[model samples]
Target chain A: ETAFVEVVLFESSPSGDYTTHTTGLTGRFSRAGAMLCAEGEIVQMHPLGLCLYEYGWVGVVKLEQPELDPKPCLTVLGKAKRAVQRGATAVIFDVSENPEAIDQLNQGSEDPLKRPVVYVKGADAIKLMNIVNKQKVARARIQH
Target chain B: ETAFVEVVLFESSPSGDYTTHTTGLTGRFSRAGAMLCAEGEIVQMHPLGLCLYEYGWVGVVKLEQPELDPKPCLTVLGKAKRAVQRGATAVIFDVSENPEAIDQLNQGSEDPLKRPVVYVKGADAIKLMNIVNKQKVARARIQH
Candidate 1:
């Protein structure tokens, strides 16, 4: 089965203006196959979401290693555990363009968080990060 | 001299709503360092803008070769000439991520049409193209 992740980021300015960008990313479900949704201010976590957050933050992490790394699942699982521990409703992983990374992620199964953990295109993630960096109050929504 | 290009692409829907996306691209003036601005519906041209448009279209082209192509100036010039002939207000080239391509474009001269021809980051150009493909009544602005 194929699934999609929709991300909408918007910043509300003080002068009664709004700036928004939407990215529709095709991703693979990292864990449990269940509908998930979350919305909050985006928080750029460590490359692995290994640190703590203020709660209800949408964590974003980039897989900075080689795309063909055999143990990609280990890294993803680690990030999920830490993100959930810090009260993240959803975690987004910036996976490399290589299909092998997606394959490895889909092959693994462990959803202790039972939350939405998705692997989106690295390029899209980069743009999302760039927008978040510029907007004054960046808010994000993840619907999977 | 450092300048900027602000692009606003918007679509008016039937239900009296508007969808808009703005891209602030840091670009180097391909030629004639003058303040040039134009706005019109976007039209994706050939890689070198060697095509025709009805009239007053914003041309977009991708540099699909090696970024370090020594003769990049030739490509830019060719595109400019053809674009102007076909009634294009501006020509946007998607140079490779490499700085060499940008350097070549900056070192260029001879803007016969005296129009805005800018070289933007390839990633941003891709996003702009994607939005144009999906939206109805897509319009763009090229300001330098």
Candidate 2:
């Protein structure tokens, strides 16, 4: 595939479904994100973990652990802070045992200032654990 | 059990209770959003659909439709647009048959110029329809 001497390449499967495409290449793209979806939108995505492309292992921690309850606790943001700090691509919080009042997507605290985080419930939470416990294979696509 | 809540409710069944409190309001609410856990952070919560006090009747719409390709399609927002226009409190976009490439939550369009819309998929979507058909009851208590 390296058939070129010094050709440029747009990263991460980028494309535009609609490009009246200039006959003279008139339009411009100053800076491009990691990806551009079906439309000319950039997705600021990047890799996580110790691999160029790999599944970032998920670690599930209780939101109300007594040991770490106060060093930081309370917000879903708090629970996920450590994950991002240690280089997790994303964090999925479980609401089965505690049964949350806050919607899974809403963080009562800071935003995903570092990385992405999502909350799961019912069977969904259980399925997430299944991914962690043994079947740690599928890609964890966590979004808002 | 009518202890009288002459309170200016936020129009939702709200509360706090990391539990553990008593006579002196003493057990404490050490946990606050981004505030670290100690106690008393009540998770204001309530039942969905069939709440003893609820705004039931959630509407379901398909996130994308091949039949209405260009006209009634722009992603979840387009489906939800009509729902909200005609008086819908919340919307559940079904990703059962059509499947989707975009993330379940991110609006590929505008900033909610209004209301709430959530995306669901696969078996979960089928079960939801089953509820609408068989149980014809309430939503399965997804949190705030």
Candidate 3:
């Protein structure tokens, strides 16, 4: 069977006010939100002693594929949009030394307003970036 | 802070995939051919799985403040488009329970084509009943 890479986009904030821009990017915002927002009191309670806008991170995934399809590509776009709608400031893509993924994205579509897709390779993917350290890597944050 | 709601069209599927043949509401598809012809080998594996023939999903969010600037909103939209460009079938707002959100969406946008919003509520939201579920949530199935 051909190895299919699934790219994911995710976002979270520093202040324990975690929010997921997408489902697979990472962290537990929805579950956390359910826990925190249960009472429905909007008085700015402190869960992790972090402010709302102080530290927020967003991310994307570039799967290694033999080819690209607009359908699956569009679906990926939908997930990215959901992440941003939640409140991610900057979204990064962890490409992991894949030049083909970058080239495909660059040549894929003509829409200039699309979200920025970051491609990380070799040491960059393994290195513990500050943003990566701050959030949880669950759901779709798997490495291929 | 005043409560304001706005609908922003973050991204549209490539021109060829969008269909206008239907009388009332048209559909958009991410051409399967594009996926098969993708430059990256692994990214092109799933050709038939990605395209949405009759429906699509658009991600959206509702803020607490009225007349909020579009910067934050745009950020969300940007990330969202990236997700769509990736592989999401459709990303839509969870406005089923909030009729006001739907009304606001209708009133805020001048173009219906851009405002492909749907309404879902209660069991519908949890059950993934509407097009939003079929496209956005279903695409997310890879997470499980």
Candidate 4:
């Protein structure tokens, strides 16, 4: 079942002035009856998780389609495995085009990806990316 | 009593190459029976946490003295409170000169600042700062 997630952003300005904003966002959880939470500095991996190979970072990947499709879910599984291998805490899929278009990110494999992977709204993703562009630093906490 | 702390650093290079390193250091805990752990992107707040007003960031402050002194502890208390006010998750005190010269960091006042603050070895602190200087983003996880 899909779940709701909250994305809290901590951002800084050009002059180093700090500010915080949070929005109630929707998301889909991987596991049916489990809790997943991830928080760290965020960076955009446009189109797919091209730059999702950083340690301790939460890579925000934008889906090619506005909705969650089988192809994208496969891409997400691969990204999740890469994130775990690279020591990243989690991967956040940016499905901002259709805020309500999130679905299960199951790999369908026998060995489940143990890493924390989630899908969140596009507005939340863009806000984070904008902040990262300005200050070179922005943080997000995602919980489901 | 003073306890040993571990500092794990995840760093990235200018070209976006990522790496990880961990060191076993020592620190003093605030409450006698408590475990304090903090991890996030680190930024230098040289000479007394001057730039520790970022949300979800762990500020690294270089102490003026080689060893922990009464005046420095007072400064730490002030910095810790400010970190909490600014929404920073933790503060890492760089007592790198004298790794074994750490003492208690208790605020004499009744209201205790509920924040994760710990002292770390100079070598560990320097390594983190150097990484941040080169990449503009370095992460540290301090556990006591």
Candidate 5:
């Protein structure tokens, strides 16, 4: 199974400082989302960041749309909720080959609640991949 | 083709402070151990807590013996030299598997490392599995 761990950071306020609260949000939430979604639970969210740095705060808000038709709408809403809670002036969302979010992100019509989202592409995606690669190597060495 | 990731924190001094120039230290030699380890370099040590933390300060250092036989001792030492240059406080590594890291952490070690390596276990492991499962769902959703 291929899993995608995406991060989204937000500015705390229109004029406040921006905080990186979503560094490793996807993995934590996806774990919960997968089960809850499979079991018919409609929504779930997982908290992340904070521990590493005193200021960073992050969380994953997942909504299950088993029918798969509402995923794009769900993705937008999920991002919107996270953006609002974190007082984000802007937001960034990444979608991997994982179909649920990708399908929604690519095909679903933008919801009114959707935040202004920026998709990481090309070099940015490659840079993120490098970090992910290093993380994988570290895990292997520790035999985790 | 399988891969994984690990977050490792190494501590260098009990005082939590370190100096570049000690009494007799001179010239370039004065800053000898300030380098950080790089990604994919093998590392070997006593596996003690302080030593592990020390490795982190130096940068990316992987466990020398990830698998079996003849070990990567030389490779680790070489990496250690480089690590000293990077000023790493700790190195995070990554790995992958069919059952995944938790399985290896639980079953792979006859002797665990000395440091307090923290992560998910038991039910937490299962939760991770569910996340992997979600990846599968996402993949399938996309294929269709």
Candidate 6:
């Protein structure tokens, strides 16, 4: 089956309740959220990672790493690997279409390190970007 | 019972294998490594919560929002509430000398929205900072 995750959006109430949901991943619950900006020295990165050299425990690397390569480098599983590599607690994978970029959860095996991953779409992307710009929109959650 | 949280330090380790362990919260298994940071960012307001408008899925704020007292504002549960508010996935809590600060899990009622909470020590903070620096060391899983 697909190893999906969830996202909780908090843009505005037209969406309902405290937040909104989106398709997503499988993993442990921990500290996760985007780090938009922090002046006077915050954190920043590469291939869009935490960098040490970074900010964000909840990683937000595009679903496709190279943007167009099916390298699995930025595929859903790949994104979690990347997030963990960068020291993030959870990760977000924006869907990408490189034909080869597959969010394959089935090596036919279970991934021991599956981190929570969420896919953003529609207004979700808009709000996510807002969070990125440090504009402060809403937060999200990712789960099975 | 108390809700304790843990921080994973990915600094160049001598810390040891299968990752280190600490007293922490109850949850599912996935890449749990992310929880610490996200939750840390959340617990900063209304008694330290993780708000999408804020830091970690578990962001942290000092224990003083009384405007000013009896607030226990920086207690463990207070921190988790703050974290959830910021849209963070989890939370981590440090300590303070304020004798007024309390870590209550017995409001006499169980927090339906109770997220995982972790407590950090001197070196624990160091490791978190290292993760913040985005330094890659190694990752460990928590299985019970």
Best by TM-score: 4
List model 4 lDDT by residue over A55-82, tens digit each: 6766677666544353553445666666
Q: What's the i-RMS of each model?
A: 19.4, 19.1, 18.4, 4.8, 19.8, 11.6
Candidate 6 residue spans exceeding 4 A from truth: A1-56, A64-67, A70-76, A96-103, A106-108, A133-144, B1-7, B13-38, B41-144
What would you estimate as the lDDT of candidate 2? 0.31
Error of 6 at B9 (Å): 3.7
**Model 5 stretches astray by more than 4 angstroms:** A1-76, A106-114, A121-123, A129-144, B1-144
Q: Give the per-residue lDDT of model 1 (tens digit) for B1-144.
A: 333544545444453233445666565557533335445556776563262244455676766656445455455666566665565556777665444557656664664455567776656666666665665555555443
- Per-prediction DockQ scores? 0.01, 0.01, 0.02, 0.17, 0.01, 0.08
Ranking by lDDT: 4, 1, 6, 2, 3, 5
Residue ranges of candidate 1 with Cα displaced over 4 Å = A1-144, B1-3, B13-19, B48-51, B67-74, B97-99, B108-112, B133-137
Per-prediction TM-score to the true structure, in the order listed: 0.40, 0.28, 0.24, 0.53, 0.21, 0.41
What tens-digit string does per-residue lDDT give for candidate 2 at B1-144? Answer: 001000010111122111111111111111111111111111112112111111112355544454535443343445444443433334555555555523434523434423344445665556555444443223221112
Candidate 1, residue B38: Cα displacement in angstroms equals 1.6
Q: Report residue A6 deviation for candidate 1 (angstroms).
A: 43
Error (Å) of candidate 6 at residue A134 is 5.9
Fraction of native A-B contacts kept, per candidate: 0.00, 0.00, 0.00, 0.15, 0.00, 0.00
- Segments of candidate 4 deviating more than 4 angstroms: A1-17, A23-38, A46-56, A62-74, A83-88, A94-115, A119-138, A142-144, B1-17, B23-38, B44-56, B62-75, B83-87, B94-115, B119-137, B142-144
In order, candidate lDDTs are 0.56, 0.31, 0.28, 0.56, 0.26, 0.37
After TM-score superposition, the amount by which residue A48's alpha carbon in candidate 6 deviates from its true location, in angstroms, is 7.2
Q: What is candidate 5's CAPRI-style docking category based on DockQ?
A: incorrect
- Residue A51's lDDT within candidate 5 is 9
